[PDB]
Design a protein around this ligand. Sequence first.
Ligand SMILES: Cc1c(C(=O)NCc2ccc(F)cc2)cnn1[C@H]1CCS(=O)(=O)C1
Length: 149
Amino acid sequence: GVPTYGAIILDETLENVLLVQGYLAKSGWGFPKGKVNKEEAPHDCAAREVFEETGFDIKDYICKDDYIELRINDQLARLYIIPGIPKDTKFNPKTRREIRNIEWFSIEKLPCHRNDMTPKSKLGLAPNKFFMAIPFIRPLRDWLSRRFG
Ligand SMILES: Cc1c(C(=O)NCc2ccc(F)cc2)cnn1[C@H]1CCS(=O)(=O)C1
């Protein structure tokens, strides 16, 4: 899979994270990210995708060792952690044909797993609009505990 890069943007209180909502297959909420171009450095891809999806430029804020990286179905996704962005920042996508909306979410209210369907004795997981964000939530909470406490 082609690797993806993007960001976890947090506000000044460290309570809230910025998610984006796409269209079609990408209808759920997720962290801003996208696929790396040929010869593009990870930091440059993260900044480009985030600026395309949110209109906010992270380039001056990225720290090289501060990221969460997950390999899901043999595709690597790396999100740089960007704290301290004011909640009153005006975010606006460049790609308004791919982004429906952009919102802050309380980290403590976000799920870190989807719910099963054990009440219905049925296998699998119930739909959840945060499906794509979910795998990052526990690692993020653990990362914020180690870094800040
Ligand atoms: C890959 C994905 C996203 C996602 O990328 N996050 C938000 C986002 C939206 C636009 C954008 F330009 C960049 C990020 C969201 N949903 N999905 C689908 C995977 C298969 S599914 O389970 O049907 C849901």
